[PDB]
C-alpha cells in the first residue's frame, strides 16, 4: 500500500487495530475509548513511516515529535511511550543506522550471545544499542553462520541463503537500503530438460505442473475435509498423502475403463439376443415361403379353402417380413453404438513413465523448499507460513549475502574460533564455558547476567550433546527439540571461463532418472556476473551426496551439463566448491521444517526462555537467564534469514525489558 498505512504493512502490522504486543505495553489504550486507539494507531503508524523513509539515521524521539502535528503531538508522553516501545522491540532504529546521540559508556548488565549468526548479530546490535555489554561467542572463523559466501577472485557465490523472498513487509527491505546490496530479480522462465538432455516441450511442462498443483490441493482436501491426519497411531506426512492421492487417481482410471468396456458388453449381448431373434425369424420365414409357394403351385380353379390358404400364408409372410425388416433397423441402431463407444475410449493411464518423472521434478522443487523428504513433512501443518507471505518478487544477492552479516558485525565484541561446550545458569547469573577450535586445550570462562543461545536446531539436537546445559533443559524444551525437524539442502557451485548457457535464463531444471534421485542436481542457477552455475541437491539425495567425493559430484554435474548443451560446449570448471551442511558441526543441517508430529506450537516452545530454580530454597522466584533466538524459534517466519533476524530483535527487546526495565508500560 501507500501512506502511513503501508508503513504498518511494511512492519508486518495491521494498521487499523492493536496487536497483542501493544495491548501488553498499552493496556490503558486498548481497554479505553476507541478514539484514543485511533490516535495511538496513527502515532504508531507515522513513527514507523518516519523510520522507514530514512533508515540510515537513528529516529530520535525529539525528531519524531517535530514531524508530528496536532492533535496528535499534544500528548507528549503517549508519543514518548509509542516511540520507546517501537525502539525496544526493534521496529524502528534496528539494523545499521548512524546514531545522532553517540551512545553513553554507562554499560548496565552483561550478556553472552552464543553464535554470530544473523539472529545473534541482530540481537547483539540491539542490546549494545540499548547500552548493554554484549559479547558474541562464535565457533567458526567467520560471521554469518548459515549465510556463507564463497569468494576467490571475481568469483562470488552463496553456499547458504541466497534469496530475499520479496520486499513487501520484509525487514531486509530496511537492511538493503542500509547496506549496498545488489538485489537481482528472479525471472520465472525455467525450462526443464530431461535425462537425455532434450528440453521438455511446453505442452508437457504446463500439463504436469497443473497436475502437481491439483495433487497438492488434493492432499489439503484430504487433510481438512476427510481428517486423514493419523494412520496406525502415527501422524500422516505430505509424502504419504500424495501417494494415497496418486494411487486413487490411478485407481480411478481403471474404474473408468472397466465401466466403459462393460457398457460395450452390455450392448454386444443386446445385439447377440437380437441376432438370435433374426437367425430364427429368417429360418422361420424359410419354410413360410416354401409353404406359400407350394400353395400358388396348385393351379386354379381353387375351392375356397385353397384360396384362403394362399391368402393367409401370404399375409403371415408380410407379417413376418415386417418383424425382420424392423429388427435390421434395431441391429443398425446398435451397430454404430459399438462403433461410437469403440472410438470413444477413455484415458489409458493416469500418468506415463515419462510424465511421472517430470512430476518428480516438481516434487524435488518442493523438497528443496522445505529442505527435506516429503515423507517427513507434517501433512496437517507444513503450509502454515504461506499466510504471512511477503508481497513482491523473490530476489537474489549478486554480491554475496555475506556482505550483510559482515556489515552487522561492525562495532561488536566477537570472539571467533570459540566453541561453547557448557552453559551454566543459576539464580544469581551465568557461566558460559568455551574452548579454542584451533587448540581444544585452552579453556575460557565467561560470566554474565543472561545467555542468548542462537545455536542451530541441529546442534541443539546432537546426541551426545555438543553443548551441555547445567542444569539440563527441561523436558518441555528437549521434546520440542526432538519433535521439530532440521532438514538438509546442499549446493554445488561451478566456476568457468565463459557463459555457455542461456544468459537470459536465471535457472533451469534437470529431470532425473528415478524417483529415489529426483533431487540429485535437479536445478541450476545463473545469477552472478561471472560464469558461475549453482546446482542444488535436495530431498533424499542431499543426505546421500555428502558421502560422495567432490570430483565425482562435479563429475555428475558435468555429465548433466554436457547432455543439455553438447559435450564440446562445456569446459572443466576452474574452481569447484560443494557444501556439506549436515556434516558441518556448527550447523548439523540447513534449516528447520515442520516435521510430522510437530506443529507450529513447537516453534513457540523453542522461543520460551529458561528460568533456573532458587539458589536458597524458599527464596523469591528468580529471573530468566537463558534466552533463545534463531530461525527455528520464530513460528511465523521459520527457516529464513528474515526470520532469524526478527528473532534476534525479539529477544533483545525481551532481555532489555527484563534487565533494563520497561518504562513505557504505565
Amino acid at each position: 500500500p501507500s501512506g502511513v498505512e503501508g508503513a504498518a504493512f511494511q512492519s508486518r502490522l495491521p494498521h487499523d487495530r492493536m496487536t497483542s504486543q501493544e495491548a501488553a505495553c498499552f493496556p490503558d489504550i486498548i481497554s479505553g475509548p476507541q478514539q484514543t486507539q485511533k490516535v495511538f494507531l496513527f502515532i504508531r503508524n507515522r513513527t514507523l513511516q518516519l523510520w522507514l523513509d530514512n533508515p540510515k539515521i537513528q529516529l530520535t524521539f525529539e525528531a519524531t515529535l517535530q514531524q508530528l502535528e496536532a492533535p496528535y503531538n499534544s500528548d507528549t508522553v503517549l508519543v514518548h511511550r509509542v516511540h520507546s516501545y517501537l525502539e525496544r522491540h526493534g521496529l524502528i532504529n534496528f539494523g545499521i543506522y548512524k546514531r545522532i546521540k553517540p551512545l553513553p559508556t554507562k554499560k548496565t548488565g552483561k550478556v553472552i550471545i552464543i553464535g554470530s549468526g544473523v539472529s545473534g548479530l541482530a540481537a547483539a546490535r540491539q542490546l549494545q544499542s540499548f547500552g548493554m555489554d554484549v559479547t558474541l561467542l562464535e565457533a567458526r572463523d567467520r560471521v554469518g553462520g548459515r549465510v556463507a559466501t564463497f569468494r576467490k577472485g571475481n568469483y562470488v557465490a552463496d553456499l547458504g541463503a541466497m534469496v530475499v523472498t520479496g520486499l513487501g513487509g520484509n525487514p531486509m527491505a530496511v537492511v538493503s537500503k542500509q547496506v549496498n546490496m545488489e538485489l537481482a530479480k528472479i525471472k520465472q522462465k525455467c525450462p526443464l530438460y530431461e535425462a537425455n538432455g532434450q528440453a521438455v516441450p511446453k505442452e508437457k511442462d504446463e500439463m504436469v505442473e497443473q497436475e502437481f498443483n491439483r495433487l497438492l490441493e488434493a492432499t489439503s482436501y484430504l487433510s481438512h475435509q476427510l481428517d486423514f491426519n493419523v494412520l496406525n497411531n502415527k501422524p500422516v506426512s505430505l509424502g504419504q498423502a500424495l501417494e494415497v492421492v496418486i494411487q486413487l487417481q490411478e485407481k480411478h482410471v481403471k474404474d473408468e475403463q472397466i465401466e466403459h468396456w462393460k457398457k460395450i458388453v452390455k450392448t454386444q449381448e443386446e445385439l447377440k439376443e437380437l441376432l438370435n431373434k433374426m437367425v430364427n425369424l429368417k429360418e422361420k420365414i424359410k419354410e413360410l415361403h416354401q409353404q406359400y409357394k407350394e400353395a400358388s403351385e396348385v393351379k386354379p380353379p381353387r375351392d375356397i379353402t385353397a384360396e384362403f390358404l394362399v391368402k393367409s400364408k401370404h399375409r403371415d409372410l408380410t407379417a413376418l417380413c415386417k418383424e425382420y425388416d424392423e429388427l435390421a433397423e434395431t441391429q443398425g441402431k446398435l451397430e454404430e453404438k459399438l462403433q461410437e463407444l469403440e472410438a470413444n475410449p477413455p484415458s489409458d493411464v493416469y500418468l506415463s513413465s515419462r510424465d511421472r518423472q517430470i512430476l518428480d521434478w516438481h516434487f524435488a522443487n518442493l523438497e528443496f523448499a522445505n529442505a527435506t523428504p516429503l515423507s517427513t513433512l507434517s501433512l496437517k501443518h507444513w503450509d502454515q507460513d504461506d499466510d504471512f507471505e511477503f508481497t513482491g518478487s523473490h530476489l537474489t544477492v549478486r554480491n554475496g549475502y555475506s556482505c550483510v552479516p559482515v556489515a552487522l558485525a561492525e562495532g561488536l565484541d566477537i570472539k571467533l574460533n570459540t566453541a561453547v561446550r557448557q552453559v551454566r545458569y543459576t539464580a544469581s547469573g551465568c557461566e558460559v564455558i568455551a574452548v579454542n577450535t584451533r587448540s581444544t586445550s585452552q579453556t575460557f570462562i565467561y560470566k554474565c547476567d543472561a545467555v542468548l543461545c542462537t545455536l542451530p536446531l541441529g546442534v541443539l539436537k546432537q546426541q551426545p550433546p555438543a553443548v551441555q546445559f547445567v542444569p539440563p533443559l527441561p523436558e518441555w524444551k528437549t521434546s520440542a527439540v526432538q519433535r521439530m525437524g532440521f532438514g538438509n539442502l546442499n549446493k554445488v557451485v561451478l566456476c568457468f571461463d565463459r557463459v555457455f548457457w542461456d544468459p537470459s535464463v536465471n535457472l533451469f531444471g534437470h529431470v532425473g532418472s528415478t524417483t529415489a534421485s529426483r533431487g540429485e542436481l535437479f536445478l541450476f542457477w545463473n545469477l552472478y556476473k561471472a560464469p558461475i552455475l549453482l546446482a542444488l541437491v535436495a530431498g533424499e539425495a542431499a543426505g546421500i551426496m555428502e558421502n560422495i567425493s567432490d570430483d565425482v559430484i562435479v563429475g555428475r554435474c558435468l555429465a548433466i551439463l554436457k547432455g543439455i548443451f553438447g559435450s564440446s560446449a562445456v569446459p572443466q570448471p576452474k574452481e569447484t566448491v560443494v557444501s556439506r551442511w549436515r556434516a558441518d558441526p556448527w550447523a548439523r543441517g540447513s534449516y528447520s521444517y515442520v516435521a510430522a508430529g510437530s506443529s507450529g506450537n513447537d516453534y513457540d516452545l523453542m522461543a520460551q526462555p529458561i528460568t533456573p530454580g532458587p539458589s536458597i530454597p524458599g527464596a523469591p522466584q528468580p529471573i530468566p537467564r537463558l534466552f533463545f533466538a534463531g530461525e527455528h524459534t520464530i513460528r511465523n517466519y521459520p527457516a529464513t534469514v528474515h526470520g532469524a533476524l526478527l528473532s534476534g530483535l525479539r529477544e533483545a527487546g525481551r532481555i532489555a525489558d527484563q534487565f533494563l526495565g520497561a518504562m513505557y508500560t504505565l
Binding site: 534469496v163 523472498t165 528472479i186 520465472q188 525455467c190 522443487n365 518442493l366 528443496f368 523448499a369 522445505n370 503450509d383 507460513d385 504461506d386 523473490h394 527457516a639 529464513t640
Partner: peptide, 4 residues
C-alpha cells in the same frame, strides 16, 4: 514455503 514454496518459492516459485
Amino acid at each position: 514455503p514454496r518459492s516459485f
